[model samples]
Target chain A: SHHVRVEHFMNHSITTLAKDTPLEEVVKVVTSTDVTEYPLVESTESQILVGIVQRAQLVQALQAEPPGHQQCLQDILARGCPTEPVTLTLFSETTLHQAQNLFKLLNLQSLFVTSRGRAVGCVSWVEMKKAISNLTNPPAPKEFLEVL
Target chain B: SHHVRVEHFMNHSITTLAKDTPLEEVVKVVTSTDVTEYPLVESTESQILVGIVQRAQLVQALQAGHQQCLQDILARGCPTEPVTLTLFSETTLHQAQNLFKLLNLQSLFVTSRGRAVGCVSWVEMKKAISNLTNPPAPKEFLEVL
Candidate 1:
């Protein structure tokens, strides 16, 4: 009963960063947003997929060379932002079971959803778990609780 | 058939920080480790759990207009999610995995008699599940029907 398509639950309101974005600017975007990973795109409008920048990578870069905050993100970008091939992505046609198997097999926190080779949104473990919970143990009816 | 305990899977070599640890030092710790969240303890030896400092919180603090050090950041009492949920060392792997899904936690602190001893993350959970599918070499092999 929990069969749902990836597109049905993927979050479309995604925040992306450019490959040349400064480290300081990246810090600002990460802090303001609750996401732990950001999809690195060619441009915000173009949304051309490139790679991903995780919080751990940024922290590692800062610790490596206590460089000025204004330093361009190019250095970290060169370090490789957990780019494609290693990244496990999903498409709109992907099913929940397929996504769940990938998550369990790879132990991933989230997966970027794409459409026609372009990132449309993301599906995370939290969202997947919520979907399972809702299907397996749905909330009781309001009238039932009142009667009890 | 799977009844492994968390003690067998939890990471004992935990990387933690003190409450007063300067921001620079904190940065070094985070960069050196692969973890995104560090359990802020009272001291390395004491292992008294205090609060958790996430990479997100650190990034936010740096971006904020307040030009201050880690000490000042702590004094301002940056909003940190308190460490309330914990798993015992003896907890079954199945139970721990269920809790992770229920709470949607990236990682969980493992305690022994109420003292923080180790940690368990999604990586460990995946390892456990994988092991179930492909068990390790057993001393005595048995045939299955």
Candidate 2:
């Protein structure tokens, strides 16, 4: 009785942050918003993801770096390849199993859903769960089954 | 000349998703935001990440489900808990290393910096490179410098 496909339960909201932003501000966003990982954007106009920054990485930087520094974020940004961003992307036309494999293999919690070289939105684990529920125990329709 | 750690190298921004939100929205967020993952949340009060969702999952769901229906995102959440969340107050540093080894992970990415660091598989490879670059000192070098 459980055979609905996954796309039947996906969400479509995308959250983002800019480069050179203060670490403190980023922290506040995480605390306030539902975002867990943020993609580092090249600029507001470009909006291209340069690299990913996890919440944990920010905390560790504070502990590792010296105190009272003006260029903390910049200092850390230099560590990663500034010119070459990691391109583990997902197109808008991929399947759930393919997405799951990429997530597991890449160990990513989210995927940048793109179309025509622009990020349109995101797909996250919570959305995946909705897919699971729809397949396993779909809500009963208000109407009864047709009489044979 | 650059010697900062991976944690220091990472960006601080993050995006999050509530467990009950629809899968279609999540896919939209990834595409719009250009992010690869969104940490799963149980509620506003707790920061515990249930799991991560990927783009591939969303596309599959879209293809499988009818275009008219709402696709649920909760079903495909990664069950593997982020190691950083439980590393503190639970697993010792040594234990954490073992977990990394088993998972073939390098440094684990944490929810907030210092709070918990995320792991990069390449880090292990970096260590190997470092070992090669800085081998043991010779007897002559040790005696003089």
Candidate 3:
């Protein structure tokens, strides 16, 4: 179990928003994708990780004013993305057990996987838990259960 | 370990909203509290858990650009995903942590005899692990290489 690699369960395809994306577009992405947080990239070509934005932050920015003076995401991010200092990143070759430990220690829901400093994929706690559950507690055979 | 009950770590003070709460008021509550999810109750007086409204859902409703009235948004713009899973106060902290990991939930509403009691989130899990690893320090300082 410790030897299992994150590559086995990491999601290779992920949706990310460019740093310069407007507030309206960001809202659309969040709503359509139904994601609580999104990875912000420098550009589509570069894909250099900027930071992540949470739904709560965006809502706060949008509703900061009394209906008329609300600013766009760009304006909100003008100073910079309010990135958490404890952002954790993982590599594809990282051991599953190590990742699990990090998830528990850091209380992370998902971690961005990077290759050569470029964000490539993501691994979620749910996936790791599901993998462990399947390995340790495989469902009993249907015929055996019926017989019992 | 298994003997540690969820009540030991669950937060008793929780902010809840009513199902009939307007979308504008909901937004204000979320913004002021900086919470991603708000548990909707059947009524303010009863405080019975009904469903949850997520920040994403509220954002979607605002961006939809069709429903101008906050009441309409609350009524039809957002889907009320009711709370189906709950943890009992007597459940072990270990079990609660496993449930959070398996379900990918940020928090869980704890109940006692089918009544809402409190909530536990990942923050509590981190604290539990930290406590297990780092027990109370001794009064005397010991140095090691």
Candidate 4:
């Protein structure tokens, strides 16, 4: 049970986007999905990470200005002159507790769990909670821990 | 100085990649940058966070099979379904810390400051180590006994 690390808890399916994608379509992706953060990739195989955008950024843009406003999210992101997203990631073998720590310390909602620098799966805060809850009140682990 | 918060530490620069970029190109970006993590956005404003890949993932793919295999990294991610969540940027320092502590967080990257739109600063970070280590004052003077 303790051996069940973050790798065991990760979501293997990945939803990605390209940098040059249109802003309108980007909005559709956010509004349409339960997920908020998307990993910007250079290519399907390349997996070059770019940057993260929060739902709030989109909401803020919408609330502060009309949808068609020129200084939209893309515009603001452009102003920063962002570089190509790089690979800032985590490991699959990391413990759930460690993942939690990294998430909190970094204030990040998600961590990309990789084997050798390639993204194999991902662990989100919500998933971490599920993992912890499952561990604490685990159906099988409870018996083992209680025995101790 | 006493009021400093974590937002002060956040870096505003957003790095990104297209969905069709090559693995070698991704490596180039990672090698050239100081960031340890990068968020994947589909477009400029979408913020539809998909999955994350790391430096370790790159190394793993590099070691697997032949050196010229382009499908290695992509194939590794294809089956590995991932998850994502949305975090608010304007949360109180205490709440932020709780989230961080409970999740064993490394840092809180933010996008707002009060009503201001610029990057975060020192005042954004919560109070210091002293606050955590210092003993609480007694409820009343007589309670000290």
DockQ (model 1, Cα)? 0.01
In Å, residue B46's CA in model 2 sits off its true spot by: 41
Fnat of candidate 2 is 0.00
TM-scores for all candidates: the values are 0.39, 0.34, 0.39, 0.36
Looking at candidate 4 chain B, the ten consecutive residues that score lowest on lDDT are B111-120
lDDT of 4 by residue, A28-116 (tens): 76677666556664444545444445555555554554444433345535554233322235556666666676677667777655442
- What tens digits encode model 2's per-residue C-alpha lDDT throughout B1-145? 1222334323335555555555566556667776555555554344444454555555565556433212243344333222122222222333344445554554433333112124333444354335455744656535555
lDDT of 4 by residue, B1-145 (tens): 2233434334446455334446676668777876555554333343434434455555566556445322345566632323222223433445555555565445533422111112222333333334456635757555555
Candidate 3 chain B, poorest ten consecutive residues by summed lDDT: B62-71
RMSD values, in order shown: 24.5, 17.8, 24.9, 16.1
Per prediction, the TM-score for chain B is 0.68, 0.42, 0.67, 0.48
Docking class of 1: incorrect
Ranking by lDDT: 1, 3, 4, 2
Q: Model 1 — TM-score against the truth? A: 0.39
**Candidate 3 Cα lDDT to native:** 0.65
TM-score of 3: 0.39
* CAPRI-style grade of the A/B interface in model 2: incorrect
- Residue A23 of model 3 has an lDDT of 64
State the fraction of real interface contacts model 3 keeps. Answer: 0.00
Better of 3 and 4 by DockQ: 4
lDDT of each: 0.67, 0.48, 0.65, 0.50
Instruction: Rank all candidate structures by their TM-score, best first, as comma-separated numbers.
Output: 1, 3, 4, 2
| lDDT by residue for model 2 (A18-129), tens | 5666656655665676565566665555454445666566555555653365553555556542322333445455566655655665467876554322344677787766
